[PDB]
UniProtKB/Swiss-Prot annotation, chains A, B:
Subunit field text: Homodimer.
Superkingdom of the source species: Bacteria
InterPro entries: Asp/Glu/hydantoin_racemase, Asp/Glu_race, Asp/Glu_racemase_AS_2, Glu_race
Protein name per Swiss-Prot or TrEMBL: Glutamate racemase
GO molecular function ontology, one term from the record: glutamate racemase activity
């Protein structure tokens, strides 16, 4: 079998929710994760510098002998994904495309909403992808900048959190049939988000969608790992490993060890 | 967008159930189908000759400018699929792999059953695929040679048909958690088959699984067609177009025109 691990690059701890999905869906696959906290916000950097940074993360992943690379950073995805994908021989994917495509396939009336980070909403990457494939679908994007913090502080059910989501999503209530959770933190607020949007709205989790694609892409490329096996993942971060495993150990429902590294 | 059609090759009218799934899932995609009835049974031919035949079907499909080829014939798949796939630049898939992979991912206790045509069961292609990936899973294959005829004569609900399925599946009742419908005719007997196997057994429809993979493979290769569009498919057969559209018009719930051709 192909015992090489599937690598994940991200400018943060967010991509770990996709890793959770992966562990959930494909237990037997090895994982290598690189989070570049030290450099922080990618969004407000210059394109040239973001490609520099991304390639650094990609090259690090290559020297982990990964058989596939997954982009978890929307900024890295916006700026580099297509270039790196064209340059590499191994499969290279992001969560945006699958999120967009799922939203398209799932919209009832063509009223698609997408919430996310300020930078994500500022790049309007999701709308661009959606309409690039299905330009007749109406995309309404909304930034929800309180969501990440809430999530990262474990608190998804506080009465304050419930209020925050309630107020942050108001501009969309009653205006859309499907809402793309364009941030990897957001899967953790799903109950609340579904609740605030009503049983009428279809929630699209990009990370979960991405994982589904992985499954098909491992089969197509004949690079599946040992199904009877992973019990050996590797996590890396360029900054603050303490709080990394802190959040990681919570999300991954198990103690995981991080390795502070410097590219 | 990529307006080229998705081609389907098969030694019969069976692959049309996959086309139905495709129309159902991806309405906007053009289809080109080639059925080689004139040559009939592929299974009991020699490998060399089956590769000859397959390539003929593939070359015909290429001169329809297809952006993807789908193998519906288990015999053609067993013998050629990997060779053609290696030779072509466009994506080339079959229904077997997706069927196998789905069964694996879906088996509760590792007791997988697979029914199908005598030739399919004789090649043991499904078991070989399943155990090649997950060799610890127990595969029990069973030939159900009355199934095709029943289906092809429109009769899926006769009290005779119900008996036939009942008796044909007996050897598996109570012995498996998931059953792969290793024949493209069989989707049409699903109600009856599910009924005979009990609510306890998980039915895997290779064709439906295959279609799902297509969706992911169109996105990965950036060759999706116009989402707002197909209303223009093309069906070909090397023998007896009369009964082709006959069955086709039934399955596809619409009148479709076939073009008798000679490779």
């Amino acid at each position: 079998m192909d015992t090489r691990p599937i690598g994940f690059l991200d400018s943060g701890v967010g991509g770990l929710t996709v890793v959770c999905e992966l562990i959930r869906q494909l237990p037997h696959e090895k994982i290598v994760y690189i989070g570049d906290s030290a450099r922080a916000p990618y969004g407000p950097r210059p394109k040239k510098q973001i490609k520099e940074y991304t390639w650094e993360l990609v090259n690090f992943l290559l020297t982990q002998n990964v058989k596939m690379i997954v982009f978890a950073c929307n900024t890295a995805t916006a700026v580099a994904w297509e270039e790196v994908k064209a340059a590499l021989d191994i499969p290279v994917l992001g969560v945006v495309l699958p999120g967009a495509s799922a939203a398209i396939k799932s919209t009832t009336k063509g009223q698609v909403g997408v919430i996310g980070t300020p930078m994500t909403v500022a790049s309007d990457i999701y709308r661009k992808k959606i309409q690039l494939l299905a330009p007749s679908i109406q995309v309404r994007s909304l930034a929800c900048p309180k969501f990440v913090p809430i999530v990262e502080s474990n608190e998804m059910c506080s009465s304050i959190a419930k209020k925050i989501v309630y107020d942050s999503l108001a501009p969309l209530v009653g205006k859309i049939d499907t809402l793309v959770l364009g941030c990897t933190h957001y899967p953790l607020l799903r109950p609340i988000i579904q609740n605030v949007m009503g049983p009428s709205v279809k929630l699209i989790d990009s990370g979960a969608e991405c994982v589904r694609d992985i499954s098909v892409l491992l089969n197509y490329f004949d690079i599946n790992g040992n199904y009877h096996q992973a019990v050996e993942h590797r996590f890396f971060t360029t900054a603050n490993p303490e709080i990394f495993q802190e959040i990681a150990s919570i999300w991954l429902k198990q103690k995981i060890n991080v390795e502070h590294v410097t590219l």
